[PDB]
Each structure stands twice: as structure tokens, then as C-alpha cells.
């Protein structure tokens, strides 16, 4: 099973560790190791660039994990965010702030990042001077008391989301819903996930969250036992539910004033809400490849956690100086690895297994011509390149990182 | 008072908003607005590059906010992480995982990120193949039930830290403590904080945390009422306290085996632990400048949240096309702003107030020569540059972003 093989790879090479492994570990709680944090950050950079900073109609925020409790009463989560089990059980995590543990310092950890955006809608309109159609994007931790946490990092109690609320004139919501479904689906494909392992699934009206009139899920073919498909991201039409309920509960006008047409209306909201940690899982699974056999993690070079590995042909004291000066130069621009242990052939394979797009070998000939050998991960091609031109050579091939 | 003037600027321009402002707001809980999230991320990038990816002896991780409870018993936080008030009160925030609220699903939100590093020490040594002296760095949220939260974002219950644990041979700890004090102090100065507004303060032995044998604080002259200095970052020698106590409580050997010299020892730990949100506060305060008067936020261009502003001389329908094509081009590489509202003079000043290093004006002459005017924030100089060479012109001046 590819999924089991990929999970074991992730653990073995330090993409992830079980949180508190030495004490047993919380239920499917996971830490991200050296390779994992870089891959996770690279995914965040690509989402932020595509959804926020690369666009002229979206701005970002970073709201607090712990908001005033009334936020989650007004949003309705207090009332309906529960599941029956064996009695109804609310899935929000609780904490108590301040010196007294009275039900007065009670707060909820956010189960979604969306509400921190909604309650700031008027703030952002004011300081960013935005007019619908425009969006507010955010990446951060959310918390849910999942009853059956598992499937690796697919379903955890602590996870990270990448959510954007796109505020539009109500009569335009349907075409903007289609736009963002297509835009988000294509984001995964642009970053290397095979089109055939993705699909769209529309929620039946009885499977809609309390805030949505229509949700379309982007699903990935993870390879689970039974049904191998799993929700990767939800794109929902939340209409004016969220701004209306916070205006009603807070007493603050959250409508938008269209100065041009002197009209006041509450925008509708289209919301792409992706799972950072689930996308992490999907990119690894889809990249995994068993090509005289070879294991290759064929990650988009923009996502690969290590962009290049400097590998001296041997531990020889004459190779180290030139190789270490090169690594120091490349580290100014990218995350790179240095490895002189063992047969160079096994070191190539070690890098291929974690998706490193390029290996740079400093051999004995490098001391007479001042050039090195660059190996491409997928094709295993081999080009000889001037030491002073290696950074340029890699920059052209890592553009967008 | 500069500090009050800077706080009000931050709120007014959307560097920060009070969390849940429309409902009153948690005690000194703050959201980061469009400008703030970019500045915060830019600070994180500079720390990660300087402490982690730019070095050959440090790797990163991202451990969970919520670890197994036994982590915080073993660390001693359960026993001693309390302050007397009016009775001793533990300052860790609590939550309950799982369906039962018995004192069995009880967990603590981490009051520091360090413990997630320590319990993974053997994991990281294994998968990253590191040998002391080496470090493990991390950025993430921490939580403390501060009794008197205030001073803006200086002391909050939810905040972000940038911590690195540098594991060394015990006999080398003192010189590595000096190294990291100097390295961290200089990081702030390299990013533009005036040397005279920083100082070092050594904790008296009676003011040492339970895990440290010696702590030196980097303090910044925030301008508080009374004593204007405040802790910006702590660099502590935690000796072998943390690895020893987790080995003792978990039963897992967390020593390091030096294969070369066949010696087994528990490394000492030097720990730079910075406050992301406090550094955010310090960079704003120190950049604030009142130079015919002008208000300028003189942020290092690597930190500035908006790298360039595209400003058509007017709303004229002939300027928009060329200006919008330029903004679209620059957004491929940087966060940029577009503003055609009001007198160009006031738009320059609007950008200066938030530290934008460059304004790019598309005037009527631009349509006959296909060049634009670039204005430098600090000097207000003005250079005429070919449309097709603007990205190169800015890239050279934003290197390191
Ligand atoms: N704001 C709208 C919304 O929240 N919508 S959604 O509730 O559908 O979660 C949005 C995304 O968060 C991810 N996600 C959700 N729950 C979990 C979990 N327990 N573990 C990991 N990832 C998860 C998943 O990728 C899902 O598509
Ligand atoms: N691991 C070692 C350590 O934790 N050490 S330290 O406890 O000293 O916190 C480290 C840093 O976190 C920041 N910091 C601490 N508490 C707060 C707070 N309540 N609000 C904002 N920033 C804070 C501050 O910048 C401080 O220097
Ligand atoms: Cl756009
Ligand atoms: Cl404003
Ligand atoms: Cl180094
Ligand atoms: Cl390994
Ligand atoms: Mg869903
Ligand atoms: Mg301190």
C-alpha cells in the first residue's frame, strides 16, 4: 500500500515525528521534523503567493487562536458544533483565562480560522481600503476534539488551515464560487499532483455545515482502506450568514457601503478552506515513485524541502574545502544539505528519497578546472558547471521557490 | 511619547487590531492586520535564515502546541511555573482532549516551545545525522496565563516565540553562550535597530528560571513609563537539565554517542529564545521617525511589509493600463500596493508612514518614453527607470527579502 509506504518514509526521514513519542504520544499528534517543517513552509509560501500576495484583490491577516467566547456563540458553533457518540458532544476545545476558573474566563480554541476574519471585516475594509469583490486570507492553527483521530496526519485534534474569505456582491456569488473551485483545484495540479488523483464532490444539502448553502470539496485519492478518497479542501458559499450574525450579536454594522452607487449591502462570502497538514500528506503520497530499482520523491522543486545537496566524491581533505565553500554560498539562497558519508551512489539515492531536485558533486577533477557536476533528480542527467556559475544554474531551475 | 504614537500608528494602519474588537476583546489579545502579518512573516524569515537555514549546524522543527501532559511534569513546569498573587497560581493554560473531561484528558498548552525540541533530540540526531555542536530551531505559539497582561503586544496570553536549542559538549558551553549572546544581539542591529537602544542584562541567580544556570537578556528601550527597558530575548545556559529530566522521566536514553571518541555524554544547551511579537514591537518603535515635517517608518527594506507602491499620477484612464501591468509584474516577486486615490504627494506620505521603501510613479511622460519614476523612501530621491528594468532595479535594492 503506497500510503503506508509513504507514511513510514515520512517518519523514517524526519518529515514527521509522533509528538511526545518518548512518553507515548497524544492521539495522532505529530511534530514536523527538519524536512517536514521546510516542506510545510514551502506549501504555505505557495498558498500565500497564489491566494494573497500574488493577487491585487486579496489581503492577509493573522488572528488569534483564542478569541472572545461570544465569537463562537454568534457564529453558532456553540449551539450546533457537536456530534453524537457513545449523547451530543461539542467538539470545541476549552481553556480558562485569568486567575479564576469560573465559567467567566472560559474560552474556546478556534475550530476554524474563518471567524477571526469575519469579525475584522470592517477593520480590513478601513485600513486596506478594499471594495468587494476582494478577499482576506489567513494561515493558522485550528483545534477540534475529534472523536476518532487517526489516518496519520489526515485527522488530528491540532492542525493548520489555509482559509480565505472572498467577499462579493451577492448576485455575483455563484460565478465566484465556480471561479474559486477551479482556481483552487488547479493550484494543486500546478504544484505537481496528478490530475487523475483529484476530484470534486458536492455536499448533499443534508451534509452542509450550518454556515454554508453549498460546499464543493476537492478530494484527493489518498489510498485509504475502503474508500480511498478524502477531503483535501472545501470551497463553500457562506452567503451573508457570518457577517449578518456578528452584526446582529455585536451590534456593529458589518455591511459594506458602495460609495460609487450609494448602496449598502452585506457581502456574500465564497470560502476556500484548505488543510495545510492534509495537503502535506497529499503532496508526499502523489510524489512517491518506485521507478535496478529506485525510490524517488518527485516533489515540485518549489516544494522540495532541500533544494540541493553538496556531495564531495569522498571525505578526502582536498575535496572538503571547495565543497564547503560552495555549500556556504548556496545556503545564502536556499536550504541545502551537505553529506560526505559513504558511497556517492548511496548519497544520490538518499537525496532522491526526500525529493532533493539537484545533487552537486565535487570530485577530484574539480580542483584542476574549478567546476562541479550537477545531477538532476528525475532524469539523473549530469551537467558540468563552473563553480562560479552554480548559483545561477540552480536559480533558473528553482524559480518560484 | 513615541511608544504611544507608534502603537496608535500600528492600529490605525492595520499592523494590528484588537482581537474580537466588536465584542470587547480579550485582555491585550491582538490580531495582525494586512501590514502586520507581512512584517511578522518578514521577521520570521530573517530569523529562520539567520539561525537555521543559513547555517550548516542548525536544523528546524515544528512541534505541537499540545504535547502529552507528562512533558510538563518532567520539565518541572507543573511544579514551579506559578506566581503568587492576590496563593500560588500555575500560569499554564489547560484544555481537555477526548470525550471525557476527567483529569485524564487534561493537557497543557505549551508555555514555551523548547520542550518539543528536547523530547525530539534523539529523533533529530537520528534523521538529520547531526553531532554536537549543533542546534534545533523553531517558531510557534506559546501560551501563559499572565496575571497583568498589557503594554500592547509586549505581554499577552497568546504570543509567538523564536527559540533554538544549541546542543554542545558541556566543557564548551561558556564560550558558546558568549557566541550566541553576541550573534543574537547583532541580528537586531543588522536589521536596523539602533545599537544604543539595546543592552544586555544578566539575571541575578535568584531571578533565574528553574531550567537555567545563567541567563542574559537582550533588552530594548521600548519607552515604557517608569523603566523604559524591556526584555526582548533571553539567551540561557540550560546545562543538561532538560535532556536529563526527560531521560529520567521517560526512561529513554537522550545522551549523545560520539562514535569518533567512543564517549557518551548528555549535551549542554545554550538557548536563544526570542519573542516574535515583542521584536515586532521593537522594530516599529525604533523605525519610527519624525523628520515641512514628515512621518517615516524607517524599516529595513527586508522587513518592510510593502516593498513597492505603484502610484499613477492620477486616475486618468491612460495611466491605469501601464501602471496596472507593472503592478502585476512586480507582484510576481514582492508584496506591492496600488493606490491612485488623491494627490500623489499624499500617497507618497501614506507609503512612508508604513515603511514602504520605494514608490513607483506612472506619469503622463511614461506613455511616450515607456519609463517610470522610482522614489526612495528615506532620501526621497527620484530616478527615471525603464519599465522593462524596474524589477531588476528593485531586486538589487531588496536583496535578502
Ligand atoms: N472554515 C471552513 C472549514 O473549516 N471547513 S472544514 O471544516 O471543511 O475544514 C477545512 C479543511 O481543514 C482540514 N481539516 C479539517 N478538520 C481537520 C482535522 N481534524 N485534521 C486535519 N485537517 C483538518 C481539511 O483539509 C478541510 O478540508
Ligand atoms: N524557552 C525560554 C523562554 O521561554 N524564555 S522566556 O520565558 O524568557 O521567553 C522568551 C521570550 O518570549 C517572549 N515572551 C515571553 N513571555 C511573553 C508574553 N507573555 N508575551 C509576549 N512575549 C513573551 C519574550 O520576548 C521573551 O524574551
Ligand atoms: Cl489579481
Ligand atoms: Cl488607513
Ligand atoms: Cl554555519
Ligand atoms: Cl535517516
Ligand atoms: Mg469538510
Ligand atoms: Mg525572560
Numbering used by the authors:
A (entry chain A), B (entry chain A): 3 to 88, 138 to 342, 352 to 461
The authors write:
Glycyl tRNA synthetases (GlyRSs) are prospective drug targets for combating Mycobacterium tuberculosis (Mtb) and cancer in humans. Structures of all three forms – complete, or in some cases partial – have now been determined using X-ray diffraction or cryo-EM. Both Mycobacterial and human cells express the α2 subtype, and notably, the GlyRS gene in humans encodes one product that serves both the cytosol and mitochondria, which has obvious advantages for the design of selective inhibitors. Similar to the TtGlyRS, the two Mycobacterial GlyRS subunits adopt the canonical architecture consisting of an N-terminal catalytic domain and a C-terminal anticodon binding domain connected by a β-hairpin insertion. The catalytic core contains the class-II specific antiparallel β-sheet having the characteristic insertion domain after the first strand of the core β-sheet, and the anticodon recognition domain adopts the HGPT fold also found in HisRS, ProRS, and ThrRS.
In the present study, high-resolution crystal structures of MtbGlyRS and MtrGlyRS bound to glycyl-AMS were determined by X-ray diffraction to resolutions of 2.25 and 1.95 Å, respectively. To produce MtbGlyRS, the glyQS gene (with an N-terminal purification tag) was cloned into an M. smegmatis expression vector pDTCF and transformed into M. smegmatis, and expression of MtbGlyRS was induced by anhydrotetracycline. The present study describes the first crystal structures of bacterial class IIa GlyRSs bound to glycyl-AMS and magnesium, which closely recapitulate the binding site architecture of the glycyl-adenylate-bound TtGlyRS. The sulfamoyl group binds the guanidinium of Arg197 and ligates the divalent metal via its two oxygens; the nitrogen does not interact with the protein but instead forms a hydrogen bond with an active site water. In the glycyl group binding site, the carbonyl oxygen forms hydrogen bonds with both the Arg197 and Gln214 side chains. The amino group is held by the carboxylates of Glu216, Glu165, and Glu324. The configuration of the carboxylates, especially that of Glu324, together with the presence of the side chain of Ala326, impede the binding of pro S substituents, thus providing the molecular basis for the substrate specificity. While the lid and glycyl-AMS lack close contacts, the hydroxyl group of Tyr264 is placed 3.6 Å from the electrophilic glycyl carbonyl carbon. In contrast to previously solved structures containing related ligands, the structures presented here also detail the magnesium coordination sphere.
